[PDB]
């Protein structure tokens, strides 16, 4: 039973390389983000 | 009259500061300054 389990391999081709992109999307968009002051908008903060 | 001219000593010295910190205000903005498309914010490009 830990070797049976498929995963997310039932889904069909197209779902799984939906779900792929927007995992990677999310992702990206939490790494990368930005944000700044209103006054001063040249320099931009990132997170961590 | 080629070392005559007082150039923009004339000027009060609040006065002088408020005009070389716009200067150098503008000239960074145009420098740092930076666009993005609509759909992918999270990467911005320069002008040159
Ligand atoms: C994991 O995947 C297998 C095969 O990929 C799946 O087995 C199907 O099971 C149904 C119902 O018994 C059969 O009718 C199908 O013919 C099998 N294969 C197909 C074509 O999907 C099953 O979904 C999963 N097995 C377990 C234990 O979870
Ligand atoms: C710039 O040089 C001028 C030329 O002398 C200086 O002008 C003085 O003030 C008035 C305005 O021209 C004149 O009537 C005086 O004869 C000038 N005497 C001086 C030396 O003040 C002016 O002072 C100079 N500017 C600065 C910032 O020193």
């Known amino acids: 039973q ?5 995963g997310s391999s039932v889904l069909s081709e197209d779902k799984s ?5 927007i995992l990677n ?7 990368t983000g930005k944000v700044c ?7 931009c903060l990132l997170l961590e």
């Open 2 to 6: 830990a070797l049976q389990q498929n």
């Open 17 to 21: 390389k939906r779900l792929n992109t």
């Open 25 to 31: 999307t999310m992702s990206t968009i939490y790494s």
């Open 37 to 43: 002051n209103p006054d001063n908008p040249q320099e």
